[PDB]
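Box 4.2: Ligand-aware structure prediction
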Amino acid sequence: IWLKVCAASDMQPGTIRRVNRVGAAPLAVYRVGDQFYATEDTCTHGIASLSEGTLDGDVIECPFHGGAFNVCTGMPASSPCTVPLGVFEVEVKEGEVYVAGEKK
Amino acid sequence: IWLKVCAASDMQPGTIRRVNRVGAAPLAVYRVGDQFYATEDTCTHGIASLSEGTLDGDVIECPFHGGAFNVCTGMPASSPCTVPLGVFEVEVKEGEVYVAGEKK
Amino acid sequence: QIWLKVCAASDMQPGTIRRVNRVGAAPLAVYRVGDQFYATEDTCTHGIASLSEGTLDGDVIECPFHGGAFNVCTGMPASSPCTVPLGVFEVEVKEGEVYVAGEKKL
Amino acid sequence: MANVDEAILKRVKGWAPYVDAKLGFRNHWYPVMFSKEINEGEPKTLKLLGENLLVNRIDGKLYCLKDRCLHRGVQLSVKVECKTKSTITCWYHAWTYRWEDGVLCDILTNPTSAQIGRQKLKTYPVQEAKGCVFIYLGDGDPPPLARDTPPNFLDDDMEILGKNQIIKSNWRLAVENGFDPSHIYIHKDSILVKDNDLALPLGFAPGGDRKQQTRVVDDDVVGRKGVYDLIGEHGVPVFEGTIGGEVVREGAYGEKIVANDISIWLPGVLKVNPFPNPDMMQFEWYVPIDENTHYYFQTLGKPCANDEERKKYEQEFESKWKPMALEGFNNDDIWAREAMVDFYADDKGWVNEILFESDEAIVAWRKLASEHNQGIQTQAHVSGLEHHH
Amino acid sequence: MANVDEAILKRVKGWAPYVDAKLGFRNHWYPVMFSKEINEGEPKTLKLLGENLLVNRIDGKLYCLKDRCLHRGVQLSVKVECKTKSTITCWYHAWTYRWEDGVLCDILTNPTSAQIGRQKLKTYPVQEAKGCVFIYLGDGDPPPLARDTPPNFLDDDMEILGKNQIIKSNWRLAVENGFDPSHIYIHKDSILVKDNDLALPLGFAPGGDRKQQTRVVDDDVVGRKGVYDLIGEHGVPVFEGTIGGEVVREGAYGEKIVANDISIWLPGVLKVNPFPNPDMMQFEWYVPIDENTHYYFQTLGKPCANDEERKKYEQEFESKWKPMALEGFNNDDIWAREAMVDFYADDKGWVNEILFESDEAIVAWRKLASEHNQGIQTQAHVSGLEHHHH
Amino acid sequence: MANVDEAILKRVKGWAPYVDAKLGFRNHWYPVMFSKEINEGEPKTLKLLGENLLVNRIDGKLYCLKDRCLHRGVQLSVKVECKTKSTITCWYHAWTYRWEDGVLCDILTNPTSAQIGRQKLKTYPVQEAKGCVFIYLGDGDPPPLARDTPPNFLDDDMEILGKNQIIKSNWRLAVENGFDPSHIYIHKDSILVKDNDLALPLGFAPGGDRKQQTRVVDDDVVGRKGVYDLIGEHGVPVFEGTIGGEVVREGAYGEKIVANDISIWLPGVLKVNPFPNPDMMQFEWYVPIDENTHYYFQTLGKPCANDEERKKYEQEFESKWKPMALEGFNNDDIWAREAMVDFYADDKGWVNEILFESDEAIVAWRKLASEHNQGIQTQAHVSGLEHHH
Ligand code: FES
Ligand code: FES
Ligand code: FES
Ligand code: FES
Ligand code: FES
Ligand code: FES
Ligand SMILES: [Fe+2]
Ligand SMILES: [Fe+2]
Ligand SMILES: [Fe+2]
């Protein structure tokens, strides 16, 4: 069920990686420091890709209108975003990053 | 004639005390440092009670529009006030505060 | 008329301006920046103001009418609304006397 | 929140929120039209608290959606396209919304769009009562309509009839004029005074203490918040007007005693009882449309026990009360409000006004409104709330 | 007194106060109407320096009260209620004021109010002279009217006639246009030129030095402060306008010599002598109404020794002078003023204008006005002065 | 720069320059009128990018001078005085300028003035091509006109006919509407559809990835910069519009296939090909007049080899294409643009808009415009550039 995304070392701190899933909406995996988080990639306010946004701490800023989300809770951090982002649990085992197959 | 307000002890410096008089308009007693002063309680710019205002040094600020008066002279200190306030003589005999029956 | 006698170099303090009137011609302005001397037309190119009545900040003269400014060395505009460059006049000191050219450079 | 210069709000410590509420109070019910004005499947437009809204009646029930497409922000009403009974489709790119919950249920120009079912157009509760349409311009589950209506307006036997129109003045100027004890002076020559033989003083000389001049109601069985004008309980009615000791005017010495029970209630509705006749009551709202205008929603209520009395009342309303009272009496209130616009337009009147005794009623209202309103409508509510982390 | 961007004021070091005086100068007399326009017991409204005022005539004397009730700030004029000869009662809550001192003497809605006798509505001095109504828009006892009038306007024998109207431009643009030596060019086709056989150049080629271009008056015994335009004393008048050396326009070669003595005086009144005829004078004010408008108060003076001459003067004024001069000549000044509105509307024109020689007269005026005005009217004066005496 | 609140510009990181360009882009050619509209010695006034301009034809050639005297800043056009063929004299103090270079060559009111020959009124390059008058609202030597025109507009045999008018909306709203793939929905009832037997979908269901939705052109030889709308190359056109799965509207099933080649180019000109007929092309500009208005400069081009064909095309244009297409089809675009004014008027729409898939085209345009525009027109350009040493 879990999706093996990449090696933890494949991501530099403060970067975002888009994860495409055939037959499903893409996800965004964020590396904040040495921690990893995951959410749907599409901003809930439009069609922007959050993986192309700006990560400030644990808050992702959308590249389109400056809306923002806390990548840990998925809750909006800045307007105009109002709809919470879907969140996916992430697990790092033996240096490999895995993301839950289903939102939760 | 002279009316008994309170004991100098009952008032901390920088505080105000309203003096309701039977069959007459109210007065306001102010303790500036270790000196006591008195004026009409009603702001000359309207119907506000200066006793509900804020004292800064020897200047009382009206709570309704922010006008102000010098409590020693009764002269306007801040707009929109323009009409001087009525001042009443105060006397501290035996650590007790008394206010004159009529304005000086 | 090639070289016009202005004054003794000693007569000008650093950072001052002196107006040089000329019969039949427009007045000039001589500036002393440090121990060096420069000159331009006295009339601001943006209007009818007299630059010798303005304020000299280093090598930049500010017009007293609208705040426009020029670089006294090149005559080029330094601040809006000025846009037309000033004519620059060569200045030389001979025997302690300041002389300004009667014709602008170039 | 933040609608007026901070320097001004800092000065009016007694009622800063009220002075800041130029656009009205959010999270309250407001009447905007009469039930008979909106028919089945015929959407109607209106602006309330600065927001453009659309109201529709479907299967007899009213629904309200914000009249602004989520996509490019155009008003859906520019070209209404209700393609199915339960939805409305934007004329631009066909984004389709359900009247019931505002959900974006379809997009004709792209049925595969990921936005479908992931966005929602703002909706507001709508309730009809006494032939009036009330909209809860607020967020979350609404409180009972009774909280925002004066006592007795919703009484079972109370027959309500009225009129509504748009007036060019901020809503607060309207409220204050209505609750102003001394403004009665402007009505001295009203046709109603003579034609309905009303006793009407020019004003009142206050008596007792200022605390007794009004009575604030901080809570009702339904959460109502209001103020009663009690200037007449210890005051002396002034019937003769004098200048330098000489009589220059007289009040009306009619036999009918009216308006001895006046109260103002949040969000801004006045109750005058009895008026314009000893057996009637007047309830009027001053509804904020935008910072410069309001709906003057007038209603006259009379208890009716049967259909015979209701029919009779309606006849009397149309032939007498509407033209003689609602128009003949209140028309002077309209230009009075308009006359106060300039002084308060720059927000400076809130600092420079010189109040006198009868204004204790207005001050009580300003404080009550400041302490118990359910929210300050801001321009950001109109364009879209903003917060930058 | 902060009416303009501080960055702009810092730039115009020669006349900053003037640029800041968008609302006009307080503490000066200003004409607002003619005496015959205000009748006994009939209050009239008007706006001066941004303030709404009411003027009334009682027993023949004029009185001026601010047209804004102290209570809720409504204009008393919305519904005028003068219930006794000496008072006016606000139509709203009946606060009553005395015309003579503005004192709140009664309140019909509450004759027991503590405000009675304690509050006072603003009053302004009013004086009638030469059939004109002047209001002292200022505080404290007023100075003599002569201080704010041009020389000879108040001469016993000087018969004054004129017209007044509201023009859409800031008062300063009107003043500068009027005192502008080179603007004479816009009058080259005026019917007055041909119809009154005037000699009128197209412009002037200045002569002499800067100081000789004008005469700044600041030592007048009556306190008058103004500037005389002396461009014609050393200048060569232009009668043949050329382009590329080729003549494209000529001035007027009439016999009547006029307008060779022009002067501007605070608070903003122009004197043109002799005009429109060799035996007359023109006096015109540009009175501030608000930042976008002004009264164009025009008057023509002609010495008259008796009722016979005064009647003839009146007939000629009505049949010739008013139509041919005040309108036929000055109408072009009106749209000229309006044409400058946009450039100065954002205050930027005060920085970007490119002046030429004849504007020396305008600069002198700007400096005189900046140094000798009696006060800068501010929006706070209009709404209510604001301060904290610290 | 400094046209929009910095807080807003900081939010739209992907296209801030574009959002800031409320007055348009400086240093680009813009069509403002047709050649036949400006006659010899008959100066005409116009406002472009917020600047008042004067255009005149002398010996057949067009000249453009800023309509604002250097002296006291009045418009020369208030009272035009062209005393000599090569000059114009300000009606106020007679400062005279040459149309050819704007140099102040004379001053009738003072022949001795030191300003003569030392001041210069702003002039702008003007060029006539295809019967259209283009003005280069920029500084320095202008680039070839071809850089600011869509492909084929300047083709040797392309006959251009058109119409121009002033529309009340910011130019960007006009540009986006024109290039908006899904706005085709507003044209479903246009008389052109039925009257010219057009095939016209209601919208599109996109296919493929983002990169495939458009083709950004930044490698054109003449230097033109633009974007092609390729939504139809992988997308399934929508002909049956549904709500809840039920068909409520259908597209047009005409035989004529048109507008399958759509591109937008800087400074803001759209090319639709073929349209309104399989053998024609439409080129339209949305020229900035001021922050609130633009010229809707419409042109239709059709190859013509000689006079007989050109004449035939002209007759068809007047009797059919102009009324049926330019007006009958595009009139809906005009009110659509106007409908977006409010949302974007406070600059907040640039932040609050909720976009969907087809807007990928608009986004590409915003990014291209932001990166390749030749300068942002500012209010300072209008009043006079400012700089402090
Ligand atoms: S698309 Fe992300 S903030 Fe708008
Ligand atoms: S009532 Fe005191 S400042 Fe107004
Ligand atoms: S005259 Fe020097 S800046 Fe204008
Ligand atoms: S603006 Fe309503 S669907 Fe696009
Ligand atoms: S506003 Fe004039 S008496 Fe109240
Ligand atoms: S404003 Fe044009 S010559 Fe003076
Ligand atoms: Fe009333
Ligand atoms: Fe003139
Ligand atoms: Fe279209």
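In the box above, the bound molecule is fe (ii) ion. The first strand of chain F starts at residue 28 and ends at 34.
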